[PDB]
mmCIF file with all atom_site columns, C-alpha atoms and ligand atoms in Angstrom:
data_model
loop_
_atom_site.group_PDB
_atom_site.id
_atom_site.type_symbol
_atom_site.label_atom_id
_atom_site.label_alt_id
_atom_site.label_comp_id
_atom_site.label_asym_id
_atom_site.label_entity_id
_atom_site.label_seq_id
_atom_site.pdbx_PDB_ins_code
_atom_site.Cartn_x
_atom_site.Cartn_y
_atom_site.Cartn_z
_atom_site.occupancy
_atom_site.B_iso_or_equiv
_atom_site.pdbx_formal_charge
_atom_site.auth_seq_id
_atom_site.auth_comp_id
_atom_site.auth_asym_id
_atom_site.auth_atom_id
_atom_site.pdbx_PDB_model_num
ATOM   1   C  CA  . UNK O 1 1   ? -30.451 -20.058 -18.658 1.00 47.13 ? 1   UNK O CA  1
ATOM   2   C  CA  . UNK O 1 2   ? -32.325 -18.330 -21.179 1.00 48.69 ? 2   UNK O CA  1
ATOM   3   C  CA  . UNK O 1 3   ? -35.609 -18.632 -19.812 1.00 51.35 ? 3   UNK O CA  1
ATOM   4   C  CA  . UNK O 1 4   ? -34.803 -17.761 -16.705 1.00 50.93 ? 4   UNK O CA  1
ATOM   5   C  CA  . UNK O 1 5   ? -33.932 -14.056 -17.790 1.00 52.41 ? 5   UNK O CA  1
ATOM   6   C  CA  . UNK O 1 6   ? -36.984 -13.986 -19.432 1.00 50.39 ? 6   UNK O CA  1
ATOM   7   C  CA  . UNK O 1 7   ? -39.276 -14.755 -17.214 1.00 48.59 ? 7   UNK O CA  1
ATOM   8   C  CA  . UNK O 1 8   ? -36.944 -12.698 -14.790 1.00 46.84 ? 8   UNK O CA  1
ATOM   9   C  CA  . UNK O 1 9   ? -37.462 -9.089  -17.443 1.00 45.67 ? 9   UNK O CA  1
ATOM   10  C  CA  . UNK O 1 10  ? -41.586 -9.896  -17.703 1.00 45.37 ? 10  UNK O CA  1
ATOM   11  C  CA  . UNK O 1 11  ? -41.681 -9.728  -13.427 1.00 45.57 ? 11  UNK O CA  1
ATOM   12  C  CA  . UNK O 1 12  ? -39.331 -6.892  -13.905 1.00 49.83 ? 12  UNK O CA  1
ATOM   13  C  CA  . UNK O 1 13  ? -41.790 -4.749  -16.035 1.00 50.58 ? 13  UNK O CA  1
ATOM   14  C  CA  . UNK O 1 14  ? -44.697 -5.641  -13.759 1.00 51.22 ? 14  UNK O CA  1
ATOM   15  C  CA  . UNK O 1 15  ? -43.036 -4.823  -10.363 1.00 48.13 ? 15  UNK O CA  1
ATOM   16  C  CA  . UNK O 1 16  ? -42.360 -0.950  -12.316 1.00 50.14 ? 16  UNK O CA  1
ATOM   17  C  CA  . UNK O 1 17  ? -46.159 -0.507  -12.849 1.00 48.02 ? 17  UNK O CA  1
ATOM   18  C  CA  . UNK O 1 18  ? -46.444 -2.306  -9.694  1.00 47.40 ? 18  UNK O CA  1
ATOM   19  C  CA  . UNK O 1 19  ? -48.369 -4.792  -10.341 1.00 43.88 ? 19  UNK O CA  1
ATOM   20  C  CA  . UNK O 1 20  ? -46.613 -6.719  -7.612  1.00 43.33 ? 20  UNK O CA  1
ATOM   21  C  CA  . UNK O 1 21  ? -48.035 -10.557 -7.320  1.00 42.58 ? 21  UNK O CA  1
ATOM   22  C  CA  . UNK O 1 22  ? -47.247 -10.473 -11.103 1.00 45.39 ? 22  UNK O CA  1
ATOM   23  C  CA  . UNK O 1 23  ? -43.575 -9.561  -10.261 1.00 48.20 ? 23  UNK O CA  1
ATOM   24  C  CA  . UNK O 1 24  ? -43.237 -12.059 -7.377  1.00 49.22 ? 24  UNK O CA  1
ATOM   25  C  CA  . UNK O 1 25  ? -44.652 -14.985 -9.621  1.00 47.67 ? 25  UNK O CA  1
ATOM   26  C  CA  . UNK O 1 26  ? -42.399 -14.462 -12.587 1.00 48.92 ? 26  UNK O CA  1
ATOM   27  C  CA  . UNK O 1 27  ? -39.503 -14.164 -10.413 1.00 50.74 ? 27  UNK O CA  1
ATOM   28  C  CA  . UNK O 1 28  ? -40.483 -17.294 -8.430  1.00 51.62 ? 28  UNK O CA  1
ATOM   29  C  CA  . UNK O 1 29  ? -40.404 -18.988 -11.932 1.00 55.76 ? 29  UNK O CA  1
ATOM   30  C  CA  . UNK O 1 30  ? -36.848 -17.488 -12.691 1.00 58.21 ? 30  UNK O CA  1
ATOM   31  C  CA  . UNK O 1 31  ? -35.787 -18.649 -9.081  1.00 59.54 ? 31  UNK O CA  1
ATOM   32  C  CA  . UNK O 1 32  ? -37.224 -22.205 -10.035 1.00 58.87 ? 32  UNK O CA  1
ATOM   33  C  CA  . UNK O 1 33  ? -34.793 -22.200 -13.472 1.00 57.39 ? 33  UNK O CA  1
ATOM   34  C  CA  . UNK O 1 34  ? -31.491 -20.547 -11.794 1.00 58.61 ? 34  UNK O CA  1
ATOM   35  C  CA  . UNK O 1 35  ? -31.155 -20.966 -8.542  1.00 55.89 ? 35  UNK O CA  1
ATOM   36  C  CA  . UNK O 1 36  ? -27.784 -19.792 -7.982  1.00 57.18 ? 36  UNK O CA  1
ATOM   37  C  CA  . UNK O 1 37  ? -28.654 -16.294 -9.279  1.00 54.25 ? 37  UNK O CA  1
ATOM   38  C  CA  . UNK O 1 38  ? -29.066 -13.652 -6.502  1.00 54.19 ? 38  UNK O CA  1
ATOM   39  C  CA  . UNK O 1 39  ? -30.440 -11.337 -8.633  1.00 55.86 ? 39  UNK O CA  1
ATOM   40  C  CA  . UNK O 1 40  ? -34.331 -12.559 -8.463  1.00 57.09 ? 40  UNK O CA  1
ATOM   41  C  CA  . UNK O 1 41  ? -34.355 -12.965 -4.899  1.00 57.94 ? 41  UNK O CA  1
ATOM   42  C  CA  . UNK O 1 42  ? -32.797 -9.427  -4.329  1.00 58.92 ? 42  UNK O CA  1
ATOM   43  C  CA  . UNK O 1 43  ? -35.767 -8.564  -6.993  1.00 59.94 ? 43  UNK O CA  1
ATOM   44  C  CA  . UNK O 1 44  ? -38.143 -9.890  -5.148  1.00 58.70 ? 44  UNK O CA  1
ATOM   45  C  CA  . UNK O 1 45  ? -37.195 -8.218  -1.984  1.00 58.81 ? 45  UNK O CA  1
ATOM   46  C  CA  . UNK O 1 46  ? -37.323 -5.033  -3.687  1.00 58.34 ? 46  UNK O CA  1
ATOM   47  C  CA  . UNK O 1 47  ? -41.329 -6.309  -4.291  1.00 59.41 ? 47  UNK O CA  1
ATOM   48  C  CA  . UNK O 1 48  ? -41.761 -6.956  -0.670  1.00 58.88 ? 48  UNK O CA  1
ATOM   49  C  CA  . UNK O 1 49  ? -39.484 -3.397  -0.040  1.00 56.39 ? 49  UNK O CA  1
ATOM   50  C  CA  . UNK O 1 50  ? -42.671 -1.370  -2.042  1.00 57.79 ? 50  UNK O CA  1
ATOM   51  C  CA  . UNK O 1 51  ? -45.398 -3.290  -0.786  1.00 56.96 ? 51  UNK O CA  1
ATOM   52  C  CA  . UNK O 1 52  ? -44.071 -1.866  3.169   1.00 52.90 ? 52  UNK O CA  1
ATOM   53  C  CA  . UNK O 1 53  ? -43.226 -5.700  4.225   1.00 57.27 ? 53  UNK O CA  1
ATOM   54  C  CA  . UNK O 1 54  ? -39.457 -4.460  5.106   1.00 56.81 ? 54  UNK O CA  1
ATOM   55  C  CA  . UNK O 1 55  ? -38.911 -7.460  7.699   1.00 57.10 ? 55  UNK O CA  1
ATOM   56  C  CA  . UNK O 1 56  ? -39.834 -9.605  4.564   1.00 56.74 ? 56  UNK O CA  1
ATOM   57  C  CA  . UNK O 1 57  ? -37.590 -7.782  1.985   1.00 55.10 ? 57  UNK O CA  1
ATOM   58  C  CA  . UNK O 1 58  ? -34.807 -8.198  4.880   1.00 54.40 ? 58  UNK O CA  1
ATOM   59  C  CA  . UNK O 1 59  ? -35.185 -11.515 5.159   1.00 53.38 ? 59  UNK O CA  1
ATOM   60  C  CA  . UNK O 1 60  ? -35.039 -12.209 1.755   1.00 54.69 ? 60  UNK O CA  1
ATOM   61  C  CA  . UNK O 1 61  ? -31.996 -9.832  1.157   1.00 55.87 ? 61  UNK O CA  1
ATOM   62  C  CA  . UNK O 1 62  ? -30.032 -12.153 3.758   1.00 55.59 ? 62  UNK O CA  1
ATOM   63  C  CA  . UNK O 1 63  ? -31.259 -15.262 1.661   1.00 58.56 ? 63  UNK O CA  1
ATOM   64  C  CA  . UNK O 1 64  ? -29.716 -13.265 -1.072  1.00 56.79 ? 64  UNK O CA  1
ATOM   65  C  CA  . UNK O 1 65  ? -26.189 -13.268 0.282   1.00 58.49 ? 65  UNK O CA  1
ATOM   66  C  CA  . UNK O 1 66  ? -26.130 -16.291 2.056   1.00 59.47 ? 66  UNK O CA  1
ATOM   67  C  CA  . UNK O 1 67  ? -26.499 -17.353 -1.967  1.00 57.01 ? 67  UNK O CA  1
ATOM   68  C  CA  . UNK O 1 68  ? -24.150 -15.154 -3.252  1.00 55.59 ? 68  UNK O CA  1
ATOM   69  C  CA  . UNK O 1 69  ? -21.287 -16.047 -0.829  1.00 53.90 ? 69  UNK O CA  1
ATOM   70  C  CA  . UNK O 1 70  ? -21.633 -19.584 -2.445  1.00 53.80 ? 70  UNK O CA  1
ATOM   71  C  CA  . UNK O 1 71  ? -20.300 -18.066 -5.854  1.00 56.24 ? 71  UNK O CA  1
ATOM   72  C  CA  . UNK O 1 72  ? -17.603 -15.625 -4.995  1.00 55.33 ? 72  UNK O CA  1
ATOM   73  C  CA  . UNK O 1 73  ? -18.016 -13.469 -7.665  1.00 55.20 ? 73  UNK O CA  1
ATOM   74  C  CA  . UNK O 1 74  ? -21.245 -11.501 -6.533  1.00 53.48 ? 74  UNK O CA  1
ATOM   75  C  CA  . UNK O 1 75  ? -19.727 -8.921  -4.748  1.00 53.38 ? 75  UNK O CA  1
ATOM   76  C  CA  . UNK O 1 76  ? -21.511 -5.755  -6.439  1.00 54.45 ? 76  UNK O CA  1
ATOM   77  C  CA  . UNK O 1 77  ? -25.060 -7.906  -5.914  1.00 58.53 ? 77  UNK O CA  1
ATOM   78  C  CA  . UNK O 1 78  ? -24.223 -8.552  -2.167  1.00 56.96 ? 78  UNK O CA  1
ATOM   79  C  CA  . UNK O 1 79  ? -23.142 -4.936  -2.440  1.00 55.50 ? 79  UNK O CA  1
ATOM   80  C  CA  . UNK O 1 80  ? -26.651 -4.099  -3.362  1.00 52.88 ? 80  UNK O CA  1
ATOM   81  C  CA  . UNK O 1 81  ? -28.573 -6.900  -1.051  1.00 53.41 ? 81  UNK O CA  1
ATOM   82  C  CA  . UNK O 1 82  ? -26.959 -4.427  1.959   1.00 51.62 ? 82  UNK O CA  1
ATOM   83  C  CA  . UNK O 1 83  ? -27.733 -1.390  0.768   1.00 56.85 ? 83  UNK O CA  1
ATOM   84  C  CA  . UNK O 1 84  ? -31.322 -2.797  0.330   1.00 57.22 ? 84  UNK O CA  1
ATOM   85  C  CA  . UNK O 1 85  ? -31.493 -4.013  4.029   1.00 62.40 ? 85  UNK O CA  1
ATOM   86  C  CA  . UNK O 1 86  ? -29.920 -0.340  4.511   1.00 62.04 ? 86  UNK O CA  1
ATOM   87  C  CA  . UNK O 1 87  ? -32.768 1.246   2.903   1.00 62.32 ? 87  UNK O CA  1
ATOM   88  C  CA  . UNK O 1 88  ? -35.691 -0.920  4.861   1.00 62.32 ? 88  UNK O CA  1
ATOM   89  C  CA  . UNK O 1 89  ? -34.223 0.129   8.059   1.00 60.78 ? 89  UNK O CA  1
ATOM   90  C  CA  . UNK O 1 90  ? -34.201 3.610   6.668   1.00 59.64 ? 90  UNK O CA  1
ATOM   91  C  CA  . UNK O 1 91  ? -37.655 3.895   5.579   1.00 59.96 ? 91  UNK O CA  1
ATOM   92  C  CA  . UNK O 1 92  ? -38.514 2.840   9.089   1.00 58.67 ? 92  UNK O CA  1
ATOM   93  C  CA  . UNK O 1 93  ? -36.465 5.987   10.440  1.00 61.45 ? 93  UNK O CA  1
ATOM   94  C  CA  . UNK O 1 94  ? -34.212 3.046   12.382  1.00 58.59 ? 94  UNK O CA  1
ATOM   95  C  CA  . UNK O 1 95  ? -30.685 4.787   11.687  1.00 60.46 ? 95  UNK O CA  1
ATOM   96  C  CA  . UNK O 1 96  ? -28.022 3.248   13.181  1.00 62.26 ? 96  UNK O CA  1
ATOM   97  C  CA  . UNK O 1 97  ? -29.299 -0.094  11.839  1.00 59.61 ? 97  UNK O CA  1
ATOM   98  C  CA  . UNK O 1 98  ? -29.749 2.027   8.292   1.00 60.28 ? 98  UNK O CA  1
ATOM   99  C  CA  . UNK O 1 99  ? -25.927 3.003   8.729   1.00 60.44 ? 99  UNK O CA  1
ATOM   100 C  CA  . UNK O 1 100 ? -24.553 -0.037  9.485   1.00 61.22 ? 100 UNK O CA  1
ATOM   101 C  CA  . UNK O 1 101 ? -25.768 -1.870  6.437   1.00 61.18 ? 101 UNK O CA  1
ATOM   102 C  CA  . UNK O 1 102 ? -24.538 0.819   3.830   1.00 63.12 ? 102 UNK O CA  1
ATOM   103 C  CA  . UNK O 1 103 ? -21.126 0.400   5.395   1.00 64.39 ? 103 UNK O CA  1
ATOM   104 C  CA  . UNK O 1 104 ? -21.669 -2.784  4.811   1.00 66.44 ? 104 UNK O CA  1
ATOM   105 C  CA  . UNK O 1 105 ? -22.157 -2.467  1.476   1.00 67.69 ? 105 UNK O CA  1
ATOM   106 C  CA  . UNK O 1 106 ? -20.010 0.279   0.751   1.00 68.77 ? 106 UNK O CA  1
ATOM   107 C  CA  . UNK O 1 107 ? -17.261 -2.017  1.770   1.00 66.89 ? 107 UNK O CA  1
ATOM   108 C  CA  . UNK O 1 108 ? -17.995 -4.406  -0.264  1.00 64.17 ? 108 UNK O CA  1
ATOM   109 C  CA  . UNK O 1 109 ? -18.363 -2.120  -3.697  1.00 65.26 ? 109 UNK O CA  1
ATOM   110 C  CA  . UNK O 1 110 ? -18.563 1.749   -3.067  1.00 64.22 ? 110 UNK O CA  1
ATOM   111 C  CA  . UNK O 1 111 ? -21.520 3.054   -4.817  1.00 64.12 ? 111 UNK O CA  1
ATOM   112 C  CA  . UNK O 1 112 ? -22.389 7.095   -4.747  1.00 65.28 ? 112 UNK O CA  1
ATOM   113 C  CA  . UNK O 1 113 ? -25.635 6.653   -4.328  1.00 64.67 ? 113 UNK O CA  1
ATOM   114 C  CA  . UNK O 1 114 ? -25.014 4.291   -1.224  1.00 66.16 ? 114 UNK O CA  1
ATOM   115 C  CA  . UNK O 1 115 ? -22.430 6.882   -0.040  1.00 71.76 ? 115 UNK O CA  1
ATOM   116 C  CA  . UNK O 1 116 ? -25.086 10.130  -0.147  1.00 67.90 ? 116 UNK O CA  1
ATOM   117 C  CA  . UNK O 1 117 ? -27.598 7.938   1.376   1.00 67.36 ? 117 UNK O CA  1
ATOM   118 C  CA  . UNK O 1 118 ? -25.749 7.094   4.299   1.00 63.11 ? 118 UNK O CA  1
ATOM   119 C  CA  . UNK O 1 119 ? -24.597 10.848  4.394   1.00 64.63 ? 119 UNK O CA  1
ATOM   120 C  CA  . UNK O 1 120 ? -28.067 11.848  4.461   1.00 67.47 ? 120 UNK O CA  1
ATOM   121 C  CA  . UNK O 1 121 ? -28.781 9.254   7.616   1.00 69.22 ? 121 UNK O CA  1
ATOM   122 C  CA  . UNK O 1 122 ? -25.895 10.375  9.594   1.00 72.13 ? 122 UNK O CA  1
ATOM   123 C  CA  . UNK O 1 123 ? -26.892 13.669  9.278   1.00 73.22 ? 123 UNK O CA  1
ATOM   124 C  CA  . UNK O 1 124 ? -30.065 12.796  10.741  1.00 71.34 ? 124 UNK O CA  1
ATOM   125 C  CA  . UNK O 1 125 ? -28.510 10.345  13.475  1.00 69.32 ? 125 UNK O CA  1
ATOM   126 C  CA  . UNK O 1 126 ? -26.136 12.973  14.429  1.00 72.25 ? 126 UNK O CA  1
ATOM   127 C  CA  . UNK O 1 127 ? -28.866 15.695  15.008  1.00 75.32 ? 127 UNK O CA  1
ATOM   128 C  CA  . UNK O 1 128 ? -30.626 13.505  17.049  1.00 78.10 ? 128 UNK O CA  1
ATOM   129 C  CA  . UNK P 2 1   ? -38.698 2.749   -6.117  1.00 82.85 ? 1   UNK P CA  1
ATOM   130 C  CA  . UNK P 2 2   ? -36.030 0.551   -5.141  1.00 81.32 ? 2   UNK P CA  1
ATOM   131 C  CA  . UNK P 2 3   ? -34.076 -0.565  -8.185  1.00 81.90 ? 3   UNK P CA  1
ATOM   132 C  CA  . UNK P 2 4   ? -34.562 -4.212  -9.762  1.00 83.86 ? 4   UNK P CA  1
ATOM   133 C  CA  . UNK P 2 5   ? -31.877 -5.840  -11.980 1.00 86.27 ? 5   UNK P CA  1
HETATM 134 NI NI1 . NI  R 3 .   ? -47.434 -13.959 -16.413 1.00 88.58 ? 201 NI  R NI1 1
#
């Protein structure tokens, strides 16, 4: 497995100076070596998140947890994989859908930054 | 930017 985490960290640092097919490459290579780990394809949805391609990043969020489900144990990463389908739907100022996913996730583990995120969406649902 | 792990 210790490969895997490397080549995971290298696409990590990339994707922060977003340098984005360098990310997705190193994290298909991690994907290739452990792939029961969420963790890279939540990654590389976060890739497809920054480069605007939020029906991507969804699709690979659900990918994600349909993974994760398989080892019970994931719940903070399938935590995260809603929040992330949360935030897509955000970005694209489609609330209720935004809403829905953080309760998702907040249900799953309660995060405060999930919590004031969803605060901050109802507030604009509600004035709508 | 959205937080990788
Ligand atoms: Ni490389």
């Amino acid at each position: 497995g210790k490969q895997a985490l490397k080549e995971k960290e290298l696409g990590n640092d990339a994707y922060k100076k977003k340098d984005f097919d360098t990310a997705l490459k190193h994290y298909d290579k991690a994907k290739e070596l452990d792939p029961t780990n969420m963790t890279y394809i939540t990654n590389q949805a976060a890739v497809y998140f920054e480069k605007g391609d939020y029906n991507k990043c969804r699709e690979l969020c659900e990918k994600a947890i349909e993974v994760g489900r398989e080892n019970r144990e994931d719940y903070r990463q399938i935590a995260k994989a809603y929040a992330r389908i949360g935030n897509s739907y955000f970005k694209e100022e489609k609330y209720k859908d935004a809403i829905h996913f953080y309760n998702k996730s907040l249900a799953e583990h309660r995060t405060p930054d999930v919590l004031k995120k969803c605060q901050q969406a109802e507030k604009i649902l509600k004035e709508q | 930017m959205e937080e990788v792990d």
